[PDB]
Amino acid sequence: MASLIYRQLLTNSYTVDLSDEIQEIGSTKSQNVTINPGPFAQTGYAPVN
Amino acid sequence: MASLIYRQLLTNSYTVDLSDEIQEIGSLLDGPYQPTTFNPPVDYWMLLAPTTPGVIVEGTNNTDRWLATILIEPNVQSENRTYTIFGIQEQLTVSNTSQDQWKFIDVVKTTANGSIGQYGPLLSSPKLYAVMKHNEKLYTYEGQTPNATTAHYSTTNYDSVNMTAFCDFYIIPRSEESKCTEYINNGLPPIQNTRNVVPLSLTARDVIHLWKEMQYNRDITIRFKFANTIIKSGGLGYKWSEISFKPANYQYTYTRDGEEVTAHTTCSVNGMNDFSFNGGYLPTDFVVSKFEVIKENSYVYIDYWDDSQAFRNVVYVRSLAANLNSVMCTGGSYNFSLPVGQWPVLTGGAVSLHSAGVTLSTQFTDFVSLNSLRFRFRLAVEEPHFKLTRTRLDRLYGLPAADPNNGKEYYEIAGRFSLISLVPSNDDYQTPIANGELREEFNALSQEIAMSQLIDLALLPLDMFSMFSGIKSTIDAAKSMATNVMKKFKKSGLANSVSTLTDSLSDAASSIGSSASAWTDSSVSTQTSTISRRLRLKEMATQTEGMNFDDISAAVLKTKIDKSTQISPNTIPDIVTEASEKFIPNRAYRVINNDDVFEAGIDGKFFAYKVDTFEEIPFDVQKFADLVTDSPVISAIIDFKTLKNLNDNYGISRQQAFNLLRSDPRVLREFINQDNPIIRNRIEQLIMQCRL
Amino acid sequence: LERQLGELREEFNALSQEIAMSQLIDLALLPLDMFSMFSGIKSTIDAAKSMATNVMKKFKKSGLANSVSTLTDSLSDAASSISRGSSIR
Amino acid sequence: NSVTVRQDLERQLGELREEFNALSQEIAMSQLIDLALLPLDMFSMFSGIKSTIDAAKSMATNVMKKFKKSGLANSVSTLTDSLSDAASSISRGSSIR
Amino acid sequence: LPITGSMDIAYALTSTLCLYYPTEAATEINDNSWKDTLSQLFLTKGWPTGSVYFKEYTNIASFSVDPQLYCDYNVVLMKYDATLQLDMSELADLILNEWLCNPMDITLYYYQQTDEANKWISMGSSCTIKVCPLNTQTLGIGCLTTDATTFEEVATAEKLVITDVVDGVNHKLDVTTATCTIRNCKKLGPRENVAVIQVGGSDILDITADPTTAPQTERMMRINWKKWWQVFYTVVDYVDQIIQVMSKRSRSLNSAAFYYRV
Ligand SMILES: [Ca+2]
Ligand SMILES: [Ca+2]
Ligand SMILES: [Ca+2]
Numbered sequence A: 001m002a003s004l005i006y007r008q009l010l011t012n013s014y015t016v017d018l019s020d021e022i023q024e025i026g027s028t029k030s031q032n033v034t035i036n037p038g039p040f041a042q043t044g045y046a047p048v049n
Numbered sequence B: 001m002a003s004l005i006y007r008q009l010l011t012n013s014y015t016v017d018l019s020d021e022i023q024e025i026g027s028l029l030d031g032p033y034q035p036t037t038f039n040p041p042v043d044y045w046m047l048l049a050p051t052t053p054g055v056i057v058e059g060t061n062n063t064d065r066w067l068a069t070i071l072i073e074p075n076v077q078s079e080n081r082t083y084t085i086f087g088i089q090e091q092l093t094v095s096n097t098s099q100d101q102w103k104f105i106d107v108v109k110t111t112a113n114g115s116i117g118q119y120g121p122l123l124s125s126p127k128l129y130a131v132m133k134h135n136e137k138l139y140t141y142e143g144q145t146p147n148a149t150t151a152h153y154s155t156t157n158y159d160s161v162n163m164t165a166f167c168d169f170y171i172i173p174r175s176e177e178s179k180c181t182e183y184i185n186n187g188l189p190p191i192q193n194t195r196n197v198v199p200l201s202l203t204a205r206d207v208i209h210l211w212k213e214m215q216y217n218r219d220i221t222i223r224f225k226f227a228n229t230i231i232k233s234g235g236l237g238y239k240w241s242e243i244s245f246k247p248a249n250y251q252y253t254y255t256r257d258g259e260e261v262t263a264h265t266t267c268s269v270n271g272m273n274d275f276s277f278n279g280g281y282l283p284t285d286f287v288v289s290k291f292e293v294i295k296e297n298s299y300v301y302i303d304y305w306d307d308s309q310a311f312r313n314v315v316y317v318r319s320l321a322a323n324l325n326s327v328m329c330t331g332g333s334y335n336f337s338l339p340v341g342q343w344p345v346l347t348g349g350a351v352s353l354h355s356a357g358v359t360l361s362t363q364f365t366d367f368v369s370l371n372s373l374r375f376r377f378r379l380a381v382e383e384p385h386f387k388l389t390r391t392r393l394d395r396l397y398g399l400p401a402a403d404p405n406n407g408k409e410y411y412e413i414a415g416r417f418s419l420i421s422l423v424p425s426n427d428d429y430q431t432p433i434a435n436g437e438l439r440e441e442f443n444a445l446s447q448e449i450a451m452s453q454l455i456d457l458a459l460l461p462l463d464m465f466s467m468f469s470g471i472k473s474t475i476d477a478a479k480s481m482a483t484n485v486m487k488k489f490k491k492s493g494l495a496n497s498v499s500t501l502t503d504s505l506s507d508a509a510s511s512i513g514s515s516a517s518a519w520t521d522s523s524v525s526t527q528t529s530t531i532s533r534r535l536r537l538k539e540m541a542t543q544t545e546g547m548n549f550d551d552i553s554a555a556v557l558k559t560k561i562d563k564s565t566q567i568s569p570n571t572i573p574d575i576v577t578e579a580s581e582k583f584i585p586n587r588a589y590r591v592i593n594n595d596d597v598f599e600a601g602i603d604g605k606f607f608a609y610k611v612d613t614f615e616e617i618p619f620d621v622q623k624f625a626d627l628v629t630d631s632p633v634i635s636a637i638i639d640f641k642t643l644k645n646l647n648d649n650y651g652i653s654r655q656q657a658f659n660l661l662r663s664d665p666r667v668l669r670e671f672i673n674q675d676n677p678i679i680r681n682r683i684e685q686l687i688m689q690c691r692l
Numbered sequence C: 001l002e003r004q005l006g007e008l009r010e011e012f013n014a015l016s017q018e019i020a021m022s023q024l025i026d027l028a029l030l031p032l033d034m035f036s037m038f039s040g041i042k043s044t045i046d047a048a049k050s051m052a053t054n055v056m057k058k059f060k061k062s063g064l065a066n067s068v069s070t071l072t073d074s075l076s077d078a079a080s081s082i083s084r085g086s087s088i089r
Numbered sequence D: 001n002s003v004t005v006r007q008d009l010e011r012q013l014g015e016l017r018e019e020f021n022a023l024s025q026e027i028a029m030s031q032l033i034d035l036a037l038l039p040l041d042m043f044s045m046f047s048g049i050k051s052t053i054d055a056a057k058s059m060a061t062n063v064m065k066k067f068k069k070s071g072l073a074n075s076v077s078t079l080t081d082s083l084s085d086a087a088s089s090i091s092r093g094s095s096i097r
Numbered sequence E: 001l002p003i004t005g006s007m008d009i010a011y012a013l014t015s016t017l018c019l020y021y022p023t024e025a026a027t028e029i030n031d032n033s034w035k036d037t038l039s040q041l042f043l044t045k046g047w048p049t050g051s052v053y054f055k056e057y058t059n060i061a062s063f064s065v066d067p068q069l070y071c072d073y074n075v076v077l078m079k080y081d082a083t084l085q086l087d088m089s090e091l092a093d094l095i096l097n098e099w100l101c102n103p104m105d106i107t108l109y110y111y112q113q114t115d116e117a118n119k120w121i122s123m124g125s126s127c128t129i130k131v132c133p134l135n136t137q138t139l140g141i142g143c144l145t146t147d148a149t150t151f152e153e154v155a156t157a158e159k160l161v162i163t164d165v166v167d168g169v170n171h172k173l174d175v176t177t178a179t180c181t182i183r184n185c186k187k188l189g190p191r192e193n194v195a196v197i198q199v200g201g202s203d204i205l206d207i208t209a210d211p212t213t214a215p216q217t218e219r220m221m222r223i224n225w226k227k228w229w230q231v232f233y234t235v236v237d238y239v240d241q242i243i244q245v246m247s248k249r250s251r252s253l254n255s256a257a258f259y260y261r262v
Helices: A004-026 B004-026 B174-186 B437-448 B451-458 B464-470 B475-479 B483-491 B494-507 B523-541 B547-563 B572-582 B621-630 B641-650 B654-661 B666-675 B677-688 C003-013 C023-031 C053-059 C064-082 D014-024 D029-037 D057-065 D069-087 E025-029 E033-046 E085-096 E228-237 E239-245
Strands: B044-049 B054-060 B066-072 B078-087 B086-095 B102-109 B117-124 B131-134 B135-143 B149-153 B162-167 B168-173 B212-215 B218-224 B227-232 B240-246 B246-254 B260-270 B273-276 B289-292 B298-306 B315-320 B327-330 B345-348 B351-362 B373-379 B386-388 B410-424 B588-592 B594-603 B606-609 B633-635 E015-020 E052-055 E073-079 E097-103 E118-127 E129-133 E158-163 E171-173 E181-188 E194-199 E220-223
Touching: A004 B004, A004 B351, A004 B464, A004 B475, A004 B483, A004 B654, A004 D057, B004 B483, B004 B494, B004 B523, B004 B547, B004 B572, B004 C053, B044 B162, B044 B174, B054 B131, B066 B078, B066 B086, B066 B131, B086 B588, B102 B588, B117 B135, B117 B475, B131 B174, B135 B606, B162 C023, B168 B174, B218 B246, B218 B260, B218 B298, B240 B260, B246 B572, B298 E097, B315 B351, B315 B373, B327 B410, B351 B410, B351 D057, B410 B666, B437 B572, B437 B677, B451 B547, B451 B677, B451 D069, B464 B483, B483 B572, B494 B523, B494 B572, B523 B547, B523 B588, B523 B594, B523 B606, B523 B621, B523 B633, B547 B572, B547 E118, B588 B621, B594 B621, B606 B621, B621 C023, B641 B654, B641 B677, B654 B666, B666 B677, C064 D029, C064 E097, E015 E025, E025 E228, E033 E052, E033 E228, E033 E239, E073 E085, E073 E228, E073 E239, E085 E097, E085 E129, E085 E158, E085 E194, E194 E239, E228 E239
Parallel strands: B240 B289, E015 E052, E015 E073, E073 E194, E194 E220
Antiparallel strands: B044 B131, B044 B168, B054 B066, B054 B162, B066 B102, B078 B086, B102 B117, B131 B135, B135 B149, B212 B410, B218 B410, B227 B240, B246 B260, B260 B298, B273 B289, B298 B373, B315 B410, B327 B351, B345 B386, B351 B373, B588 B594, B588 B633, B594 B606, E097 E181, E118 E158, E118 E181, E129 E171
C-alpha cells in the first residue's frame, strides 16, 4: 500500500552508489567541448606596420 | 519472508549491466614518458604524442634498416625541409595538401649510406603516432583519421631494435590494440587516466598499491599551479595551433601544527572547451586552431601527498572528506610573437575553485610512487573576462590556458581533511603506525546459532538494504557490494534453473500428470524426485505457503555473515551464491487436497497420508502431479516422519497439526520454545544441512 | 524506424493460433520479473545492451504510464481539495 | 557566456515545515484513505511532482540518498543486526532481560 | 520532576553581593576608605562584613570583554552615554541572559544560525567582523568568497559584538582572530544572578534582537544621578529591593570559573 514508497526508498538505496560512481567517473572522463564557430567569418584587418 | 533476499538479488540484477558499462568506461595508460632512447619491450604498442615540429622518433636495426618518423604542420606547400635523422642531417621535399590535419610520414633507409625514402602518410588531427615490433614485423599506422589502419614492415632482428625518441610516449600491451587505435584516431583520453600524469622519465619500475578504526584528521594547504603547451604552427608565424593545459607538479613545505610537512602535488584540468579564432586563410592572417578555456563544465583535480603519518596511513580508508576553502585562478597576458603588426594578447579570464569531493589516487615521481589524495574542484567563472586583443573575440568568460598562473608562483587552498583508516590490530594495544578454509569456517559456525532466534530472523524479510546495510567495509568496497553479489547471483546455478524453467514454460505455452505442464515434466521415486527438484523453484516463483527452506537458508546466511571475521567484500558474492545454490540440498514439498497430503522429496522419498490421523495411504503420482502443478506447495520444514513421531510421542491438537502441516512459524517457534526434542532435532538437521 | 515494428506486428498477430491454453495459464501464474522476462531470450547476440533499461525508457512514457500518473494526481487532488467539496462529477 | 548565475536561496526549513504542517487543513478523510490504499511506488510518488523540471537529476535518487541515512534506516539496520546477533547465539548480557 | 503544592495551606547572611562600578565613580568619591564605609552601611542593612565585594571597571567597552560576574548576586552600575546605546544593550544582553557558547573556527568552516535564539558573540581588544552570505553551491551573494574586501561589515574595532545574521544561510566570516574571538552562542534564558542599574539617561536597553520586542525586565533599573555618593547610598539603602528583584542562578552547570561565595 502507500507504505510501499518508504519500503522501496529503503530497499533500492543501493542504486545511490551506482549514481555516485556515474557522477565521479563522468567528471573524470568529461570530454572537451567544441565551441562551434558561427556562419560568419572572423576576418579582420591585415597585419599593418 | 527472509527468502526475499534471493528474489531481490535475482530480480535487480539488470542494474549489473549498468554497473558493468560504467566500469567498462572506467577501463590506465602508462605514461607519459620523457624523450629518451630505450629498447621497446616486445608485445607493447608505443604511442607517441608530438608537441613541436621535427623528427618524432628515430630507431634502427643497425644491420639492414633505419626507420624514423616526421611530423609536418598542415597548410605547407612543396618545400625542402631539413631534419636531423639518425644523427645525420638530410633534406627532403615534402608537401602538406591537408589544411587542418598534421602529416606524419615514416622515413626509411635500407642502407646506412643510401637514399632516404618517405612512406606511410598519416593525416591526424589528434597528433598521435603508433609503433610495434613483434611477429617478425614492424607495425606502423597509416590512413587518414579516423580511417587509420596498421601497415607492416620487414626489418630483420626485430627483438633487438632500439629507438631514439623525442616526445611524450605511452606503452599499451598488444591486447589493447583496439584501445590504441581508438586513441590514435580520436585522441587521448583525459589526462587524469594516465599513470605518470607528467613524464617522470621512464623509471616505471615503481610499485603501485580484526581491523581497528584510526582517525587522522589534519589541516592542509594544497599549493598547485598550471602548465601550458603553446604549440606555434608553421609558416611566417602569424598563426598558432594549440594552447592547452597540461598537468603540472609542485613540491613545497609548510607548518602543520609543529611538524614541518613537506608535500608534493600535481594539478590537472579536465573538460575544457576548445575556442578558436580562424582569421581566414591568407598566409598572413591571425589564425588559431584550439585555445582551451575552463568553465563551469570543467573540473580540476589536484593529487596531494606529504611525508606524514596521516598520509602513510592511507592504504585502507573507511571514511574520507574535505572542506577546503575556495580559491581564485586569474589568467595572465600572453603576447603573441606576430612577425609584423600589433601583437595580439590573451589577457584576463578568472575562475573560482570550490571543493567537490575527494578520493584516493596514486601520484608518481622519477623514483617512487605516492599514495596521494585526489581533490576534485568544480569551477565557477568570475568577473575578470578574457579578451583576445586585435581581434573580435571580446567579452568572453572563463580561464584560458595562456597564462593561468598569471605570474604567481602557486595557488594556495587551505583547509582541513578528515579520514578514518583501518589498521590491522590483533591486540588491545600495538596500534600499528602505518599500513576451502573459508567454507570450513562457515560450516563450523553452524553449531553456535539458536534455532528460535533463527526462526525469528527467517520471518524477518531481508531486502537489499537490510541484507548488506550491517556489513562495514572500506570506502572503495562498501560502494559496490550489492552490484558485486548480483554480478555472480545472476550467473549462479539457481538463476540458470530459473531461466530454464521460464523458457520451458514459455515454449510449452505455444506428461507425468493428467495435464502436460512444464512443472511436472523405483519409477515413482525417480519421478517424484525430479518433480521435487523442479518444485524447488516454486519458492523463487513465490508460489508457496508458510516458511521456506530458502527462508531458513537466507536467515542462516545472514547470521553467519554477521558472525564471520574472515569474509572479504570480494568473497561475499561467492558465499551468497553458494548459499543460495547449496543450502539444504534435501528439500521436501507437500500438497494438501481435501484431507489428503502428498509429500515428495528430492531424495526420492514420497509419502501420502491423511491430515487427521497421519496414516499412510498408497501414493498417487498422477494426483500428486496434478495438484502440485498449480496448487500451493508447502515446504515440509517438519517432514512426515517427524510429524508422525511427534504425534505418537505427544498429543498434537488439531490446530497444532494443521499449523505444522501448513508450516506455521508461530507453531514451529512454540514447539521450539517448549523444547520438544523431536522438532528441535528436525530444525537442527535443517540448519546443519546448510553447508558450503 | 517503425516499418520494422509494423512487420513485427504482423508477425506477432500470427502467433495467436500457436498457443496452448493450459500452458498459457501456467505461464500467467509464473511471476515474470525483470530477470525472468528477458533472461531466456533467443540468443543474446553480441554485446547485448541493458535491455531492461531500454524497455523501461519507453515503458515509462507509454500511455499506460501516463494513465497511472493521471490516476495518482487525481487521487492526490481529491485528498487535497476539501475546499472544492463537491466539485467532481 | 556570462558570470556563473548563483542559484536562488531556497527557504528557511523551519518556516517550510510550518507551512507544510499548515497544509493539513486542506485534507479530506475519505480521499486521503483512497490515496493511502493506492500503493505509491518509485514512479507514482514522483511522477506528478515538480511539474516538468528540466534537469530532474534523479529526484528518486536524491530522496533515496537522503533517506538511507535517516533515523528510520538506522533503526531498521539496528533491528536487523540485533536479530542476526540473537540468531547467532549472542552471549546475553548481564542485564539483557 | 513534578513539584506538587497546595493552594490553601498556610506555610508559617549566607550570600555574597558584588557591586560593579566605573572608575570615575571612585575618582569622584575620592575617599580611600569609601569601600569600607559602604561595607559598614551594608552591615547596618544586614550584610555581614566581607559579604560585599566591590569591582571596578574602567569603561563599558572594557568591561564588556568577557564580563566576569563572580557573586551570588551581582549589581552593575552602568553609566549612560548617548553614543553607546548599542554597546550598553549588548552588554546588558550578555550579562542579564545565559548563553550556551561553542567555539567557532571561521578560518576553516562556514557557519549559519539555527534559530532566533542563536547568535555570534565576539569579544576581544578589537573585533572587526565582515560577513559574506553563501548559496547552496557555496558561492557568495553580493560578495566574492575569496576577496574579503568585498565582504559586508557588521562590526568595526568593537570590544563586544552580538551579531545576528539571516538564519538558514551559510556565511563566511573575516573576523580579525588575532585580537578577537567569536563564538556560536544560543540564548537559554534569563540570568537572574545579575541586575543592571543604568545611572544616567533614558531607558534604551534592547536585550532582544527581535525588533518587535524591547522588554524591560525587573532587573533593568534606571536612576538619575548627579553625585556618585548619592547613587551608592541609594543602592545600599534599597539593597533589599534589588535582591528581591534578583534570584539565584538556575543554570545546572557550565565551564568552571572563579566565584566569590560563602
Ligand atoms: Ca559587498
Ligand atoms: Ca559593541
Ligand atoms: Ca539570525
